[PDB]
Motif scaffolding. Sequence first.
Motif: not given
Length: 150
Positions: A16-19, A21-25, A38-42, A120-128
């Motif tokens: 969840p902590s990684l998910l 993050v991706i939604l952040s951007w 929504r950005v200040g809460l997450g 491409p930055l979100a997919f790389l992290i999720f898979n990283l």
Amino acid sequence: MLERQLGYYLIQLYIPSLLIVILSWISFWINLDAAPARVGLGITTVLTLTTQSSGSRASLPKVSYVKAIDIWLAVCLLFVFSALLEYAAVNFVSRQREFGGGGFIQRAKKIDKISRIGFPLAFLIFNLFYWIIYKIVRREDEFEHHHHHH
């Protein structure tokens, strides 16, 4: 002597902590100012779960302490790295918004570029983190499992 059993709580807590993050951007495209609520809460939920995560590490912060430093010293920097280049790019445009910032009104019409590079930055992290989480438990926590290889 129960530190090797902590990774279990870090694995399910990292998902969840990684998910978030991706939604952040992905959500920052509009939360940048339109609705940063929504950005200040997450952002407060990630920094609060990380600072408190060190609470259960009082038993014996040795094995998990070192492994936690290898992950705690790259994420906060990587997340603020890509975010620092963007917050510094718009300010480097004119290098002096105080001179002529009247042309910013026509800047609200963004092309959502944040999604272009964030894709491409979100997919790389999720898979990283997915390939490193299901792998670390094997090449580090193998003694924790029995038959399951991963």
